[PDB]
Short mmCIF file of C-alpha atoms and ligand atoms in Angstrom, two decimals:
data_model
loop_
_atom_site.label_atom_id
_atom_site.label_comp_id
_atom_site.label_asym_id
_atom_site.label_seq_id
_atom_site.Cartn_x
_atom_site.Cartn_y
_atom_site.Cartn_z
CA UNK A 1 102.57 169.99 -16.56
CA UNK A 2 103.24 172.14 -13.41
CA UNK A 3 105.79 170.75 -11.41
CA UNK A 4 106.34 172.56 -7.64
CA UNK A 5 109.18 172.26 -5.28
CA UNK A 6 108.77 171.27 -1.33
CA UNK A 7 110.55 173.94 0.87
CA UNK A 8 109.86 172.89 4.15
CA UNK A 9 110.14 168.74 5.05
CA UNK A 10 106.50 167.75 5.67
CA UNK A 11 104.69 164.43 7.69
CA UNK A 12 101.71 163.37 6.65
CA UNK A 13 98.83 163.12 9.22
CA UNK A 14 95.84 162.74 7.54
CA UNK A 15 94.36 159.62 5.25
CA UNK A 16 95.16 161.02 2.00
CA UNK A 17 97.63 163.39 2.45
CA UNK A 18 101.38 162.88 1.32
CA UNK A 19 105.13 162.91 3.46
CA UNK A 20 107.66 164.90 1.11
CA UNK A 21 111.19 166.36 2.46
CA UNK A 22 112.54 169.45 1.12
CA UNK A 23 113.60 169.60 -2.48
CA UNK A 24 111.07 167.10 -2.81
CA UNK A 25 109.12 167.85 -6.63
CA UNK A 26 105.28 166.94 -7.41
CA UNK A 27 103.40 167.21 -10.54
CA UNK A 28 100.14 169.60 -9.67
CA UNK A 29 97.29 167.89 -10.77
CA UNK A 30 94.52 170.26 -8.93
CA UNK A 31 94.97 173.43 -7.35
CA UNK A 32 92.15 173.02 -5.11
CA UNK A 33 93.06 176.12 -2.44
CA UNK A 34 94.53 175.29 1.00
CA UNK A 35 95.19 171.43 -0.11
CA UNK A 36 96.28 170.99 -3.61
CA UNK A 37 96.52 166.67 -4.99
CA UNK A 38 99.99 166.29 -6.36
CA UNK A 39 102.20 163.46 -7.63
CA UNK A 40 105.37 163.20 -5.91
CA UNK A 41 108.08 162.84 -8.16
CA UNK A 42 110.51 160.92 -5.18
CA UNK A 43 107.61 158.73 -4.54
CA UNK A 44 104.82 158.54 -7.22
CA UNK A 45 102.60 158.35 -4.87
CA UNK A 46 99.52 160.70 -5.11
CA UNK A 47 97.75 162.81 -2.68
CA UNK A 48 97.26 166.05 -1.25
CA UNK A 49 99.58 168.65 0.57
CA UNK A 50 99.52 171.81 1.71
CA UNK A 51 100.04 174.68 -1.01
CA UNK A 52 101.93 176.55 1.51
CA UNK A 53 104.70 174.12 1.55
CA UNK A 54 105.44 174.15 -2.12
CA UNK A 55 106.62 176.69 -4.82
CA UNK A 56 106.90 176.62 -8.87
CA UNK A 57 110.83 175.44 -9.57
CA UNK A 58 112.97 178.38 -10.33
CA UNK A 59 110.42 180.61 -8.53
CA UNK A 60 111.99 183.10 -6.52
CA UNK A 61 110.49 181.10 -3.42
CA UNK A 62 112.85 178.71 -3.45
CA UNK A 63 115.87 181.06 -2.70
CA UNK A 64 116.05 180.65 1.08
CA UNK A 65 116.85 184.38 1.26
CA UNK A 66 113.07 185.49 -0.40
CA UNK A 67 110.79 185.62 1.45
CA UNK A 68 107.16 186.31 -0.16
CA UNK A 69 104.47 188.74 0.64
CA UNK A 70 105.87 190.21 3.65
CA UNK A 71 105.84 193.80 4.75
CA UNK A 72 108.38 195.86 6.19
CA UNK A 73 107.34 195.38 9.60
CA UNK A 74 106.97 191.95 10.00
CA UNK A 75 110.27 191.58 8.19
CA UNK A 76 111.67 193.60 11.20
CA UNK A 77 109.90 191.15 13.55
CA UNK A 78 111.07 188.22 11.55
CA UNK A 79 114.77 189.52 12.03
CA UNK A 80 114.59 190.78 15.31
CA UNK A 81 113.27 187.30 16.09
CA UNK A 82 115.48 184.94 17.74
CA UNK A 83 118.18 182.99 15.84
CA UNK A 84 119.43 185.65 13.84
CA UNK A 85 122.82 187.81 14.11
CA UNK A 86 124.75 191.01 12.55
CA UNK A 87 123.55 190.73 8.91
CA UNK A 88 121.20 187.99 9.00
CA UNK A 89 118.96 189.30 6.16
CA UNK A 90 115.95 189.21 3.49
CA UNK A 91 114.60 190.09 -0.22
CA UNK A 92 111.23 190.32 0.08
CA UNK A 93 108.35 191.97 -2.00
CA UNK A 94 108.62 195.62 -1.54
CA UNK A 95 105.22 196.99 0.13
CA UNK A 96 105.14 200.65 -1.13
CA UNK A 97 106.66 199.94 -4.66
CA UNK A 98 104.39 197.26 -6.23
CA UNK A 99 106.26 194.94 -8.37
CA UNK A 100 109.56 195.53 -7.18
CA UNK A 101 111.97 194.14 -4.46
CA UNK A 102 113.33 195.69 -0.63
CA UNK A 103 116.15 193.98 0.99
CA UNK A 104 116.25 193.96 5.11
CA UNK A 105 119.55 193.59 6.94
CA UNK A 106 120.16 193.15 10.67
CA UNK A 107 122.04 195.70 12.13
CA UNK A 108 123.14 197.17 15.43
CA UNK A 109 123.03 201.17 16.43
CA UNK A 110 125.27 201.81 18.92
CA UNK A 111 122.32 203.81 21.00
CA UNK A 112 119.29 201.80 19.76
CA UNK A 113 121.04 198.20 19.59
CA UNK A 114 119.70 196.14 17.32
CA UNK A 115 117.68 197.43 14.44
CA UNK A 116 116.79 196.59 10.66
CA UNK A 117 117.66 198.64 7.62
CA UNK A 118 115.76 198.72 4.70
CA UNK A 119 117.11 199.15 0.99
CA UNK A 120 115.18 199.79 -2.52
CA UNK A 121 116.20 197.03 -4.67
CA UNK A 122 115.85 199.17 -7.85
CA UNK A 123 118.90 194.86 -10.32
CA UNK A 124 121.50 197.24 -8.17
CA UNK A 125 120.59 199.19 -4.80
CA UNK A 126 123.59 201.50 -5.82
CA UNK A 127 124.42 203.06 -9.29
CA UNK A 128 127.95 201.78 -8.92
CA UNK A 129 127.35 198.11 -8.62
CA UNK A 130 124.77 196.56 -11.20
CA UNK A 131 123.31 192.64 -10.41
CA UNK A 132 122.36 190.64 -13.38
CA UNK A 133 120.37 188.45 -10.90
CA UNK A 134 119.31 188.93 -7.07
CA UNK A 135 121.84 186.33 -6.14
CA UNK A 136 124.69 188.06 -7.74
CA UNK A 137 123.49 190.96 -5.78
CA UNK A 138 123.19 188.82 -2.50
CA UNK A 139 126.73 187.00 -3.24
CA UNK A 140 128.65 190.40 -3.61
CA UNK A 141 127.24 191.99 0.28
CA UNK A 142 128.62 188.92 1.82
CA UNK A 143 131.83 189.74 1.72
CA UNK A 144 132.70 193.22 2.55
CA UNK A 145 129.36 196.18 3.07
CA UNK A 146 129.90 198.23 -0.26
CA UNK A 147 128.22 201.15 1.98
CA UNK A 148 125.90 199.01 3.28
CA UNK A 149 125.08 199.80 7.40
CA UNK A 150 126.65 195.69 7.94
CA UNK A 151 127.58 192.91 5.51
CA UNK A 152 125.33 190.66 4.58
CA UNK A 153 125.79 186.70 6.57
CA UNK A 154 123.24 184.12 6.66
CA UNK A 155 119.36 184.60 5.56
CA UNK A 156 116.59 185.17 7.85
CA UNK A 157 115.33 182.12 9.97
CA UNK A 158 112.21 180.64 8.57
CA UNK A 159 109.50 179.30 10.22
CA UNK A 160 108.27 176.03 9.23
CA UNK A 161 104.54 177.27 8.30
CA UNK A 162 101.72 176.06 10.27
CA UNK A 163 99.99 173.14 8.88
CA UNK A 164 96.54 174.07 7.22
CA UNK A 165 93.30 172.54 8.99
CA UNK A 166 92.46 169.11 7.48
CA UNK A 167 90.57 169.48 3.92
CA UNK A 168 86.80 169.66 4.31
CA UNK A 169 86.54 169.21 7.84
CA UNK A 170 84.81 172.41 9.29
CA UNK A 171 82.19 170.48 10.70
CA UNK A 172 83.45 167.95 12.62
CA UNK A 173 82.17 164.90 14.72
CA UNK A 174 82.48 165.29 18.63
CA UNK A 175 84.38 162.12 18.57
CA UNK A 176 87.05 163.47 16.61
CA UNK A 177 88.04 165.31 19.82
CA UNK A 178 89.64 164.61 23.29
CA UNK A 179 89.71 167.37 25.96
CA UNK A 180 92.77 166.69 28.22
CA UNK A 181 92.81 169.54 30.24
CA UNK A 182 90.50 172.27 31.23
CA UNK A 183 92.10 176.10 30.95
CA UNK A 184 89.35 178.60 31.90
CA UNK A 185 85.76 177.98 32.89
CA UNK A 186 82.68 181.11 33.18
CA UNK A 187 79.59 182.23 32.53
CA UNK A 188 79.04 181.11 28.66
CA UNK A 189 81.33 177.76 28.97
CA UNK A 190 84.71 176.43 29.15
CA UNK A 191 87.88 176.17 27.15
CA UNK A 192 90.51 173.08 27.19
CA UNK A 193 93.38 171.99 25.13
CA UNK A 194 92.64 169.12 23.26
CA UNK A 195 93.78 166.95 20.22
CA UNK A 196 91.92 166.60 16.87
CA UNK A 197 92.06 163.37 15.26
CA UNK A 198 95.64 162.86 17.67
CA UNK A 199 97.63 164.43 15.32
CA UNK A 200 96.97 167.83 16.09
CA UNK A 201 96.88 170.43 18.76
CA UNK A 202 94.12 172.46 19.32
CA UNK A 203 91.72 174.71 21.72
CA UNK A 204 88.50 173.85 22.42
CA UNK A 205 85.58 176.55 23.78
CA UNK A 206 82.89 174.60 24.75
CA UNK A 207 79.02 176.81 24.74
CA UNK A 208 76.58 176.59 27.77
CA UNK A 209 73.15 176.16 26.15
CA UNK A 210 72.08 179.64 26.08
CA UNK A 211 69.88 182.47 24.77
CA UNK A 212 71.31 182.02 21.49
CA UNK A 213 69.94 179.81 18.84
CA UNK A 214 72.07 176.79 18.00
CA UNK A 215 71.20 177.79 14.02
CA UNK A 216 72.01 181.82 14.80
CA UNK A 217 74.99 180.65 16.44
CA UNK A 218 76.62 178.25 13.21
CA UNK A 219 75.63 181.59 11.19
CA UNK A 220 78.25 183.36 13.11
CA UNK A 221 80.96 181.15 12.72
CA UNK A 222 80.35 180.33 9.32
CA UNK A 223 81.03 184.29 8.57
CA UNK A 224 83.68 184.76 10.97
CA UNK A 225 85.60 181.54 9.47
CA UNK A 226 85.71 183.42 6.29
CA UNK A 227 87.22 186.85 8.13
CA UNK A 228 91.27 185.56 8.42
CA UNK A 229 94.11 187.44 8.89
CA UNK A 230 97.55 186.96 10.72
CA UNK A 231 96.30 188.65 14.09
CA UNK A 232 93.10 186.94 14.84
CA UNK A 233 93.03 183.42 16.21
CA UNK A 234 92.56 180.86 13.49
CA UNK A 235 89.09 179.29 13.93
CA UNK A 236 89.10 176.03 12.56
CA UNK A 237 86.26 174.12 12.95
CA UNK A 238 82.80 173.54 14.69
CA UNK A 239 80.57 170.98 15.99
CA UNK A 240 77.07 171.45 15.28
CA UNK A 241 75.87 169.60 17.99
CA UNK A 242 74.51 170.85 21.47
CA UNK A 243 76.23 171.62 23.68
CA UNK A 244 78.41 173.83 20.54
CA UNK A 245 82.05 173.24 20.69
CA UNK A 246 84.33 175.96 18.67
CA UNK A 247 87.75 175.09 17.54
CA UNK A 248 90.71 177.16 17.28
CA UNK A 249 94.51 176.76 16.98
CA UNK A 250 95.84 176.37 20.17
CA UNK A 251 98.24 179.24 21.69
CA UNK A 252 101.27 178.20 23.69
CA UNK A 253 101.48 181.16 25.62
CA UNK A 254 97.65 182.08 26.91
CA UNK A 255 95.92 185.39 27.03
CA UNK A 256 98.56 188.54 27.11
CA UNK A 257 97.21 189.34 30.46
CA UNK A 258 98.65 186.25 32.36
CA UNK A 259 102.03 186.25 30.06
CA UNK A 260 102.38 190.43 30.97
CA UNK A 261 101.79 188.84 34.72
CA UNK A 262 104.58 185.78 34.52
CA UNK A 263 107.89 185.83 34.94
CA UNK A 264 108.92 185.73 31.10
CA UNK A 265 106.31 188.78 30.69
CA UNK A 266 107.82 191.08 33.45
CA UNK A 267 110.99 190.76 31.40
CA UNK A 268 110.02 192.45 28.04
CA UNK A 269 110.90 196.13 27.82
CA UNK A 270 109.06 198.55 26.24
CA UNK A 271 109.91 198.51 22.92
CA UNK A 272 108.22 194.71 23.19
CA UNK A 273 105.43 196.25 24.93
CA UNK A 274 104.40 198.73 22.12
CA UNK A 275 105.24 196.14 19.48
CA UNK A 276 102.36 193.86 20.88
CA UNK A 277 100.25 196.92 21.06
CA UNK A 278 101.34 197.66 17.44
CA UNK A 279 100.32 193.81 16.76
CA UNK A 280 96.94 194.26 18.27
CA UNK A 281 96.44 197.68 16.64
CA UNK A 282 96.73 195.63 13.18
CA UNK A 283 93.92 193.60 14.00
CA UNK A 284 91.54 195.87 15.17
CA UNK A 285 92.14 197.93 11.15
CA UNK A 286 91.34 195.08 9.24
CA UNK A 287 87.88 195.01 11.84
CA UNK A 288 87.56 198.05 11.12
CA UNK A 289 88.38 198.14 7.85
CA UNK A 290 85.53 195.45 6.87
CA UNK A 291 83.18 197.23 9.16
CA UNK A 292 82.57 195.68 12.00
CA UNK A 293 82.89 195.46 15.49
CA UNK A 294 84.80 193.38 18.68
CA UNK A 295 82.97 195.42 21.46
CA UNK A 296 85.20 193.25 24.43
CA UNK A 297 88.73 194.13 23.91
CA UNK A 298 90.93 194.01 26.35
CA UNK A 299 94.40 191.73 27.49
CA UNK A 300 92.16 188.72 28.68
CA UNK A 301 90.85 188.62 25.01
CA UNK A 302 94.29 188.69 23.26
CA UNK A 303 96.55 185.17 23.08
CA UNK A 304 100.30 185.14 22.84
CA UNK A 305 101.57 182.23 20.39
CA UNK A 306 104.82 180.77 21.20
CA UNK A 307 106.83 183.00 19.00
CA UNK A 308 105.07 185.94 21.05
CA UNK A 309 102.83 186.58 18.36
CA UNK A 310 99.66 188.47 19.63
CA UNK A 311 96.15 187.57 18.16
CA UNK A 312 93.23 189.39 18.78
CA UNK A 313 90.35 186.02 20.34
CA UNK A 314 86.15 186.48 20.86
CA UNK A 315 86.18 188.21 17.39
CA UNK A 316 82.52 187.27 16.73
CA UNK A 317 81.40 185.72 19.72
CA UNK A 318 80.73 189.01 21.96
CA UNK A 319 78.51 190.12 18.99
CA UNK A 320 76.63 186.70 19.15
CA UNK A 321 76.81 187.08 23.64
CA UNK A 322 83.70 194.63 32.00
CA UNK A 323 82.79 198.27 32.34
CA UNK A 324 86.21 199.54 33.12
CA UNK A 325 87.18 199.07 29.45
CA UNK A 326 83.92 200.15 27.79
CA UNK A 327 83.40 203.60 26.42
CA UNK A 328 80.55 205.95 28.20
CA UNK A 329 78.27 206.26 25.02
CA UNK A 330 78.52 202.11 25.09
CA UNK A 331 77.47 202.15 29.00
CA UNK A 332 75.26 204.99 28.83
CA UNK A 333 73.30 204.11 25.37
CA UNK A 334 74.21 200.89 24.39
CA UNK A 335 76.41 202.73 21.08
CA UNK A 336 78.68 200.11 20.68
CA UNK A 337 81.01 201.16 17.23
CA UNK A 338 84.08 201.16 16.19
CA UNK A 339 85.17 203.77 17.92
CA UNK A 340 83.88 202.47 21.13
CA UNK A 341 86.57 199.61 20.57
CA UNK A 342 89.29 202.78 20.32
CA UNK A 343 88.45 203.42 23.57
CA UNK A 344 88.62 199.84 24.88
CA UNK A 345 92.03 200.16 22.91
CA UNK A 346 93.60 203.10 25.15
CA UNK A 347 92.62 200.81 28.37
CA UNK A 348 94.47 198.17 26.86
CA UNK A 349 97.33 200.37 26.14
CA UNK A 350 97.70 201.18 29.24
CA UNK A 351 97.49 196.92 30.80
CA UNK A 352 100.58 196.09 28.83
CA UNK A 353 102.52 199.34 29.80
CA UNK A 354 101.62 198.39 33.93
CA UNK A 355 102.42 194.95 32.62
CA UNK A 356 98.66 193.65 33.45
CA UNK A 357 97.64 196.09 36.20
CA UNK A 358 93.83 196.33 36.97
CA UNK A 359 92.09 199.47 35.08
CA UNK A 360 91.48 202.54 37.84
CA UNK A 361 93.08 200.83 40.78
CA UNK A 362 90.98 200.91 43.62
CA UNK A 363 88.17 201.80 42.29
CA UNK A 364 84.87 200.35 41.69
CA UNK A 365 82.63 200.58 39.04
CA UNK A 366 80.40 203.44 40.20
CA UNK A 367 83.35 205.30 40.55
CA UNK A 368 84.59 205.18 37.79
CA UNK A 369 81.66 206.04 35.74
CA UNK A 370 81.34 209.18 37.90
CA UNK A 371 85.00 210.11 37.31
CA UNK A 372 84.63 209.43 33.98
CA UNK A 373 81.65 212.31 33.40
CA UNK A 374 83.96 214.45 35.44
CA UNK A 375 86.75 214.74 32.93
CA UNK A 376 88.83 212.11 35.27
CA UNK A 377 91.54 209.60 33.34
CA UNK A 378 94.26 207.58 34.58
CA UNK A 379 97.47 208.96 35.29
CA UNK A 380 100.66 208.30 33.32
CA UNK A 381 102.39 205.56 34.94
CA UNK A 382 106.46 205.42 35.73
CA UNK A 383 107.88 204.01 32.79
CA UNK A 384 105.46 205.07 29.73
CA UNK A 385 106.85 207.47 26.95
CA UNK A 386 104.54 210.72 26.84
CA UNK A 387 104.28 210.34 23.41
CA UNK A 388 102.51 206.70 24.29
CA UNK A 389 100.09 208.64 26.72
CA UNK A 390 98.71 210.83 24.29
CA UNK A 391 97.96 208.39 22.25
CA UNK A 392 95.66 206.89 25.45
CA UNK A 393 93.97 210.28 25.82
CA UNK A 394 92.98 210.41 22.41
CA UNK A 395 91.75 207.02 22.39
CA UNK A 396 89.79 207.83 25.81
CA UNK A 397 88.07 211.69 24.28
CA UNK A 398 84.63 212.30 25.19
CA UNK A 399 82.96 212.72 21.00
CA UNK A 400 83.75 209.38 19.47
CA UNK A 401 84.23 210.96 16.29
CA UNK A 402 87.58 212.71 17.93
CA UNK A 403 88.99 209.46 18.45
CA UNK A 404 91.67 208.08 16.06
CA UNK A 405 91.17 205.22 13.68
CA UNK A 406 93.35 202.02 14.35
CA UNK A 407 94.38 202.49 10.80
CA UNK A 408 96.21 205.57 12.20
CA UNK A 409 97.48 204.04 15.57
CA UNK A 410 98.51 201.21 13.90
CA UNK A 411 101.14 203.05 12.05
CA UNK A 412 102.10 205.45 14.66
CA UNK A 413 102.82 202.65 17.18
CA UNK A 414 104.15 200.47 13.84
CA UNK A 415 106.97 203.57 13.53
CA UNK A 416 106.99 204.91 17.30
CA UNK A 417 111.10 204.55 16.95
CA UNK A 418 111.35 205.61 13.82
CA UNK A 419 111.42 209.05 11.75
CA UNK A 420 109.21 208.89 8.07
CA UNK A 421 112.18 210.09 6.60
CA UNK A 422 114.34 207.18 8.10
CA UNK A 423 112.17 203.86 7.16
CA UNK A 424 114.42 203.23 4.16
CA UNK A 425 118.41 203.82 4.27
CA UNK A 426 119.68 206.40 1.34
CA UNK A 427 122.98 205.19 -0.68
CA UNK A 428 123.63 207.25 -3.57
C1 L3G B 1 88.80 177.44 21.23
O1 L3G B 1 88.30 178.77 21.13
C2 L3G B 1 88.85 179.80 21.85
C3 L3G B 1 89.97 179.60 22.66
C4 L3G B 1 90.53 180.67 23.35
C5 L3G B 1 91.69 180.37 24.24
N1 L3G B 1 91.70 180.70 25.56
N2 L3G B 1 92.94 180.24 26.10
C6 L3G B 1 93.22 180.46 27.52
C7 L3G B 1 93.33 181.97 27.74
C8 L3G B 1 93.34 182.32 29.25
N3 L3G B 1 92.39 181.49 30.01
C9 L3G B 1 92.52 181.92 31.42
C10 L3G B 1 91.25 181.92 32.29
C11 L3G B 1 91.58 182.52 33.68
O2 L3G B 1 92.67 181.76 34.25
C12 L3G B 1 93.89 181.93 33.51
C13 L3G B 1 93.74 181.30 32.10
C14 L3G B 1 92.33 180.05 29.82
C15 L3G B 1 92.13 179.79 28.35
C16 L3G B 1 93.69 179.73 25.15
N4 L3G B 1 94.92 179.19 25.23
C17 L3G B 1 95.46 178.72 24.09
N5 L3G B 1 94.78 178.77 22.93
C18 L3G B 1 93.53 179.26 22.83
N6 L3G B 1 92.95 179.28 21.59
C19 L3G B 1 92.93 179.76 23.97
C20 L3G B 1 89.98 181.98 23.22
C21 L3G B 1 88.87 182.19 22.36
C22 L3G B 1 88.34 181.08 21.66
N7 L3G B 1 87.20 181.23 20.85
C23 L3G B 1 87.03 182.21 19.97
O3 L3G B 1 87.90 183.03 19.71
C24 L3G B 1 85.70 182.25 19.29
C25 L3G B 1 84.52 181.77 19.85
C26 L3G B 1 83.57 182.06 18.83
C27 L3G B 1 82.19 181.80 18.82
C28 L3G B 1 81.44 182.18 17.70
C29 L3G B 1 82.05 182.79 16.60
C30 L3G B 1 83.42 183.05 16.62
C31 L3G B 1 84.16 182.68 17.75
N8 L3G B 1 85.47 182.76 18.06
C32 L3G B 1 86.50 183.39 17.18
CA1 CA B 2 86.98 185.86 26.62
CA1 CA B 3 114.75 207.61 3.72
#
């Protein structure tokens, strides 16, 4: 007899799924991945819900200040994040010390402004003050820092997670969707928001009939379904059908290049501006990582959520279907790799620090791939770090194999701000 415990309130949408509110507890009765069937204690009425929603009882989970399988960067994102204040805080998993527990605490640096601190959880942090539990540890830091860089006030804001995609429904009937508005239209199709099923939210890319095979095609979405992580767009579902239509979760604030180009965008400093970078950097490793490719990266292929989360889009479809942003080997030979995409990476660098600026300004493709053979790169612009620069010119060398590997960029621009020796805070 498993019994779990809702944390977030939840409305059902679906035919067989069930409401619960928070503190809400179901019997388990199959733990069948994204969608588990449950009895609900409050209600006895069985159905399914979404696994994310739910914890054991007396799991750590519960505790509104834990906060599961986080790392230390996101935790700074999720503080940073507005809603929070001086000592707004979290115990999460730590990420370098398996098994154990970091605490994160919102703090403010007189020259940085506001910046997290990170702590060991070893419970006590200090020698001096031992914790039988993490909430006797949590209880004493809210009153008075005990050498702590700020007392501890309320938890870290949580985000109601987003709902998983209905259960068994990656291939879905046309008539399940209504396209309300048209966003973008090109060579290879069109993309609208739309509602699945009116319930839900989504983006639709509709395919123009093409050289592609409509059986090749489902191939490539069937694998790239399976290829998730936090910082590629969520493809949720297909329809077989000619003309194809793909389905993704919609993303409130468009591609980064019109956001850098609004209002909103023109307001976020720097700091911002290498955080998305960072974002996008995180992507590209886990590509990497699994061995393949993007080969068209750059800001019109990256959406901003509402949150100003950036996810990488087109993962998969410009291997199934802009020179400015492609390396010479690719233009010259065809050599599309990974480190082709490093290049494509320093271009995009260099859009979100000129906040959406067109690569080589003024001039045309020809010239460019002249300049290019030349030894020619762009120019440092007004307000980008040196430090950020270099990174560009070793994205943009000449051997591929000089080039760094996003696993590397994506911790230098994770920790641009910060000194090794400074990601966790020391209290003897
Ligand atoms: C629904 O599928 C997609 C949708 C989008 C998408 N574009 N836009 C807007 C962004 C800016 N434009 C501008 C045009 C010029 O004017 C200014 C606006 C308007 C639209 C969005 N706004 C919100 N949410 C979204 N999801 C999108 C991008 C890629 C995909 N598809 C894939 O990622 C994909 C296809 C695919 C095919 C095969 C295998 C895998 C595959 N994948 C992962
Ligand atoms: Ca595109
Ligand atoms: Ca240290």
């Amino acid at each position: 007899r498993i019994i779990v415990v809702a944390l977030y309130d939840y409305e059902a949408i679906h035919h067989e799924d069930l409401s619960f509110q928070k503190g809400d507890q179901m019997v388990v009765l199959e733990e069948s991945g994204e969608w588990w069937k449950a009895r609900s204690l409050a209600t006895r009425k069985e159905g399914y819900i979404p696994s994310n929603y739910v914890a054991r009882v007396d799991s750590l989970e519960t505790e509104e200040w834990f906060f599961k399988g986080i790392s230390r960067k996101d935790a700074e994102r999720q503080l940073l994040a507005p809603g929070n204040m001086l000592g707004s805080f979290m115990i999460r998993d730590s990420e370098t010390t398996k098994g154990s527990y970091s605490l994160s605490v919102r703090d403010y640096d007189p020259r940085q402004g506001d910046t997290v601190k990170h702590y060991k959880i070893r419970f006590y942090i200090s020698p001096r003050s031992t914790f039988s539990t993490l909430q006797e540890l949590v209880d004493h830091y809210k009153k008075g820092n005990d050498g702590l860089c700020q007392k501890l006030s309320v938890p870290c804001m949580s985000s109601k997670p987003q709902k998983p995609w209905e259960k068994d429904a990656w291939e879905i009937p046309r008539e399940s969707l209504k396209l309300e508005k048209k966003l973008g239209a090109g060579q290879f199709g069109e993309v609208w928001m739309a509602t699945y099923n009116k319930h839900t939210k989504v983006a639709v890319k509709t395919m123009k009939p093409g050289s592609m095979s409509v059986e090749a095609f489902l191939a490539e979405a069937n694998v790239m379904k399976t290829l998730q992580h936090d910082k590629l767009v969520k493809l949720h579902a297909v329809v077989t059908k000619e003309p194809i239509y793909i389905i993704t979760e919609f993303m409130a604030k468009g591609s980064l290049l019109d956001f850098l180009k609004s209002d909103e965008g023109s307001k976020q400093p720097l700091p911002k501006l290498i955080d998305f970078s960072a974002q996008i950097a995180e992507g590209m490793a886990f590509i990497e990582q699994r061995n393949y490719i993007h080969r068209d990266l750059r800001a019109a292929n990256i959406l901003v959520s509402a949150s100003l989360v950036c996810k990488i889009a087109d993962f998969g479809l410009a291997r199934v279907i802009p020179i400015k942003w492609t390396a010479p080997e690719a233009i010259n030979f065809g050599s599309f790799t990974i480190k082709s995409d490093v290049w494509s990476f320093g271009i995009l660098l260099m859009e979100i620090v000129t906040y959406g600026r067109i690569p080589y300004p003024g001039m045309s493709n020809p010239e460019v791939i002249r300049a290019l053979e030349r030894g020619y790169r762009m120019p440092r612009p007004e307000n980008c770090p040196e430090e950020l620069y270099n990174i560009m010119m070793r994205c943009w060398k000449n051997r591929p194999e000089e080039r760094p590997t996003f696993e590397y960029i994506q911790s230098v621009l994770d920790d641009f701000y910060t000194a090794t020796e400074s990601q966790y805070e020391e209290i003897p």
